[PDB]
């Protein structure tokens, strides 16, 4: 015992409280992308912090790339500003981290087919497309990627406590079906 | 006259800052042949990880279906 999951990035959603014109938002934004073949929203991006974000015409936008709360709190303000700096009336509220990303190594390889045979009612493993394993932690609800290499990822958490728990919950499941 | 299944592919958005276009990125940069970050086993898988469970976290970061 002694690994602890390390935070790698975080994702939060923000709302301007006002609708915007994706066509003009991407045309007025110095760093934005609008692909009508993927969806109906724009994609902003800044190098300080180096993160990315996608705003919707409904004002609701999602920002990702931060590694903590203060990291995302600043990235969002910058995006919401690009809109007000463009002339729109975007605001800065409804900010909340709904997904935290973490990762760590158990120091040993794990049997991908062993975990899928013990938790087939929750774990997933497709040797025809994904050589890694995907465990959908029941509580909290999070997805953990485990590769024979020993790399464990944890995304979908809603609070640092979630990522630290998801690992403390599957930590044993892996040690029980380790490979070495 | 429409499409089936509204929403964008954010399987990577929750995996580590990505461009809704499906481009996953990393707040930090790495110029080595192997360091912090996932190799090329997840990036190419994320584009297709929306068929085992990420589907939920897929539409959970881009509710672009109300305009």
From Swiss-Prot, chain A:
Residue windows of the sequence repeats: 7-83, 97-174
Q: Which domain of life is it from?
A: Eukaryota
Its annotated function is as follows: General transcription factor that functions at the core of the DNA-binding general transcription factor complex TFIID. Binding of TFIID to a promoter (with or without TATA element) is the initial step in preinitiation complex (PIC) formation. TFIID plays a key role in the regulation of gene expression by RNA polymerase II through different activities such as transcription activator interaction, core promoter recognition and selectivity, TFIIA and TFIIB interaction, chromatin modification (histone acetylation by TAF1), facilitation of DNA opening and initiation of transcription.
List localization entries: Nucleus
**Principal location class:** nucleus
Q: How does it assemble?
A: Binds DNA as monomer. The 1.2 MDa TFIID complex is composed of TATA binding protein (TBP) and the 14 TBP-associated factors. One copy of each TAF1, TAF2, TAF3, TAF7, TAF8, TAF11, TAF13, two copies of each TAF4, TAF5, TAF6, TAF9, TAF10, TAF12, and three copies of TAF14. Interacts with TFC8.
**Keywords, sorted A to Z:** DNA-binding, Nucleus, Repeat, Transcription
Q: DNA-binding: is it a keyword of this entry?
A: yes
Q: Which GO terms describe its molecular function?
A: chromatin binding; disordered domain specific binding; DNA binding, bending; DNA-binding transcription factor binding; RNA polymerase I general transcription initiation factor binding; RNA polymerase II core promoter sequence-specific DNA binding; RNA polymerase II general transcription initiation factor activity; RNA polymerase II-specific DNA-binding transcription factor binding
Gene Ontology biological process terms in this record? DNA-templated transcription initiation; negative regulation of DNA-templated transcription; nucleolar large rRNA transcription by RNA polymerase I; positive regulation of transcription by RNA polymerase II; regulation of transcription by RNA polymerase III; RNA polymerase I preinitiation complex assembly; RNA polymerase II preinitiation complex assembly; RNA polymerase III preinitiation complex assembly
**Native species:** Saccharomyces cerevisiae (strain ATCC 204508 / S288c) (Baker's yeast)
Q: Name one GO cellular component term.
A: transcription regulator complex
* Protein name as it appears in the record: TATA-box-binding protein
Residue numbers of the full-length protein present here: 61 to 240 of 240
Q: Which family does it belong to?
A: Belongs to the TBP family.
UniProtKB/Swiss-Prot annotation, chain B:
Superkingdom field: Eukaryota
Query: Where does this one sit in the cell?
Result: Nucleus
Coiled-coil regions listed: none
Q: What does this protein do?
A: TFIID is a multimeric protein complex that plays a central role in mediating promoter responses to various activators and repressors. Largest component and core scaffold of the complex. Contains N- and C-terminal Ser/Thr kinase domains which can autophosphorylate or transphosphorylate other transcription factors. Possesses DNA-binding activity. Essential for progression of the G1 phase of the cell cycle. Negative regulator of the TATA box-binding activity of Tbp.
Instruction: Provide the family line.
Output: Belongs to the TAF1 family.
Q: How does it assemble?
A: Belongs to the TFIID complex which is composed of TATA binding protein (Tbp) and a number of TBP-associated factors (Tafs). Taf1 is the largest component of the TFIID complex. Interacts with Tbp, Taf2, Taf4 and Taf6.
Question: Can you say what this protein is called?
Answer: Transcription initiation factor TFIID subunit 1
User: What is the species of this protein?
Assistant: Drosophila melanogaster
